[PDB]
């Protein structure tokens, strides 16, 4: 889901 | 804090190619996820696509596969839907819509909209 | 693609009543990615419930979403005048995103 391609993003920027 | 801000209504000629922009202000351009999503004059809204711009990720609704582009400008944090092949049934208002955080998370849906830009096709 | 079904497209209520809007989606929805939206005539839509459940800071605590898989629910617990407007389901929960196709809720008189 392309939609959660920002949250995954978000997680590993951390 | 995060504000988006289109630019003017525009007449374009049938057949023509159409850009509209949206220019972000407040949070982070590159990370979080840009749509467009359309709404003929008198009619409900539909999803056209979006854009994550880090990554250059694109995602089109598979009615508009083939007649639309959408980018992203990192520099402006500005994004950029093209439509192209234009006829009367794409008169409509466009709005770009970047989803919303927690209280920052990212959400998926949207929270932040555009202003909208009506585009009239026409003669 | 998931249709998303908002049936009544209309609701008459009064000022003050419970108002209960539904949205039936074809098949179901990924991890219960189900927002809602308000629109007012020449206004943008504004986001009331994501995930299914989860409201905005700002928005009224009203306003409620529940369901999950193919079944879902928006409740105004109250309506206030302001709550007489267009509401929006979308699902979000595979790559192709699609909207209900609205329920008005207008003012029985």
């Known amino acids: 889901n392309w939609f959660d391609i920002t949250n995954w993003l978000w997680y590993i920027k951390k | 804090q995060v504000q988006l801000v289109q630019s003017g209504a525009e007449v374009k000629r049938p057949g023509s190619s159409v850009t509209v922009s949206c220019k972000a202000s407040?949070?982070?351009?590159?990370?979080?996820?840009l749509s467009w999503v359309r709404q003929a004059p008198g009619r409900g809204l539909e999803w056209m696509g979006g854009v994550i711009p880090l990554l250059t990720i694109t995602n089109y609704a598979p009615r508009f596969q083939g007649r639309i582009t959408i980018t992203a400008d990192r520099s402006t944090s500005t994004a950029y839907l093209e439509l192209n092949s234009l006829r009367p049934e794409d008169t409509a208002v466009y709005y770009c819509?970047?989803?919303?955080?927690?209280?920052?998370?990212?959400?998926?849906?949207?929270?932040?909209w555009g202003q909208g830009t009506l585009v009239t096709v026409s003669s | 693609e998931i249709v998303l079904t908002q049936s009544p497209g209309t609701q008459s209520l009064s000022p003050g009543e419970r108002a209960t809007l539904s949205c039936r989606a074809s098949?179901?929805?990924?991890?219960?990615?189900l927002a809602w939206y308000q629109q007012r005539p020449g206004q943008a839509p504004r986001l009331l419930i994501y995930?299914?459940?989860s409201r905005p800071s700002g928005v009224a605590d009203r306003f409620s979403g529940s369901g999950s898989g193919t079944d879902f629910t928006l409740t105004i617990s109250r309506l206030e005048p302001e709550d007489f407007a267009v509401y929006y389901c979308q699902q979000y929960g595979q790559s192709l995103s699609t909207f209900g196709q609205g329920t008005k809720v207008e003012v029985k008189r």
């Open positions: 995930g299914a459940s």
């Open positions: 819509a970047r989803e919303g955080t927690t209280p920052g998370k990212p959400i998926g849906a949207f929270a932040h």
């Open positions: 098949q179901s929805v990924g991890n219960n990615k």
């Open positions: 407040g949070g982070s351009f590159s990370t979080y996820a």
